Ligand binder design. Structure first.
Ligand SMILES: [Zn+2]
Ligand SMILES: [Zn+2]
Lengths: 267, 267
């Protein structure tokens, strides 16, 4: 008979013996100290570089680049990442966390950031590497967008006649991509899978890109533009009030209702 | 040969033909209007009730209840939810969104909110229902905590000798629960699974609770206290700097580094 075993029950109750406001304060205190100098002795090199401000709140308009600017200046940033492996490792880990807690609009922007970066890599024939901080955090954007979009996609993907979110990200087949939602999820799932596998160089085909091809089907900004559009226009084809609430509240996140109480017996 | 088909490529590029700053503004505008009066004609009833302020920013300290208060006043809130099905449906959908975008500390608090509520239901022999707004959003807290904790749990759960996060939430067996992390993820995954199945009443065994039992192994606040503790103390057993960065940045989320550019060619 499936049961929580006797010993684990003791383990579970014993949190009560240790949990305390000052033990928690000293925890926030130790993790905060790690975040004070997270690169330690090894930050990315001081240099005169248009990338200096992001190599040291990120402001999208101030940090904005045209596609043409990314193609001209992207290789410099790429060489910085690859040529500073300790720094890139620290960056990767911090990027992974940031992207796992980003709001919806930020998470769209990060999907485009990741795909535009790969498109730039492809443009220059640069390999797509697991250690690259942008490529290697594909799973973070992926999981963030899955969390936030799942109940809406349950409805929308049925309306499109497509596989559900989990089957999409499980099969990971280019031939399943039929719209922008399947595109963002299938491509990011393929890319996250090849990262987790730790292939030294990730095949352009992972992105649906063939030999000598350039990814003409992906325009930078398409994840943002297209997913916001479907959150908007699906309600025209869908008679569910709950779905409409879901889509609306994704687009307009200020808190209104939904939280009832806080109960903490331990501290 | 697996490929993105010709027609879908056109579909993908055609976002460029529609995406525009004012189309986006009019989207934020329509979803914002839905959020202005999301209950419409059917909010929860005006009544003299300690729950009135959450039946209309949620402040945890002001909305705080002791375990004993939840047991005395919980049945009132429960009857409000069950006896107002349109309102509960709207609440559920808005709660689901809120919990899918909550920060880590909020998401811990919501795990405890959900488990303490079930424990109260069990205490009173009240059924656990899919339409109940707190029970029915178990998947939201679940996916939120998975997003944020996944790369840390990859390391920690290995250190404990347990199944990985996905196998835990896939097998959903009480006999897999060996610590606080497996507990929160296995129990919430079982509970989310029984919600998605739409059983009219969800068996107490879903929570590891047997016939006439009371869930003595779960103390309100255990998800918060215990997960913060493991983020703190795992670094004592683990020689990985990346893991330490990961845990630290989960506990201390202010942005520091990790975002490089914003590229949007469409608008
Ligand atoms: Zn719908
Ligand atoms: Zn570790």
């Amino acid at each position: 008979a499936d049961t929580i075993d006797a010993t684990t029950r003791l383990v579970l109750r014993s949190i009560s013996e240790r949990a305390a406001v000052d033990r928690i304060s000293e925890s926030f205190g130790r993790s905060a100290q790690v975040m004070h100098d997270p690169f330690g002795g090894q930050p990315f090199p001081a240099a005169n570089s248009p990338w200096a401000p992001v190599l040291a709140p990120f402001d999208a308009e101030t940090r904005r680049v045209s596609w043409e600017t990314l193609v001209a200046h992207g290789p410099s940033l790429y060489r910085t990442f690859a040529g500073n492996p300790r720094a890139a490792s620290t960056a990767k880990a911090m990027r992974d966390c940031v992207l796992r807690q980003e709001n919806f609009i930020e998470a769209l922007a990060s999907a485009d950031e990741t795909l535009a970066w790969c498109k730039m890599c492809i443009h220059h024939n640069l390999p797509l590497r697991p250690q690259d901080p942008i490529i290697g955090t594909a799973a973070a954007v992926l999981d963030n967008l899955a969390t936030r979009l799942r109940p809406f996609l349950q409805c929308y993907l049925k309306a499109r006649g497509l596989c559900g979110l989990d089957e999409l990200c499980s099969r990971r087949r280019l031939a399943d991509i039929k719209d922008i939602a399947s595109f963002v999820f299938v491509i990011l799932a393929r890319l996250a899978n090849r990262v987790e596998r730790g292939v030294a160089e990730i095949d352009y085909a992972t992105l649906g890109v063939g030999v000598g091809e350039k990814m003409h089907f992906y325009l930078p900004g398409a994840c943002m533009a297209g997913l916001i559009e479907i959150l908007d226009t699906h309600r025209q084809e869908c008679s569910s009030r709950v779905c409409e609430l879901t889509a609306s509240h994704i687009v307009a996140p200020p808190y209104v209702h939904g939280k009832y109480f806080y109960c903490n017996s331990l501290f």
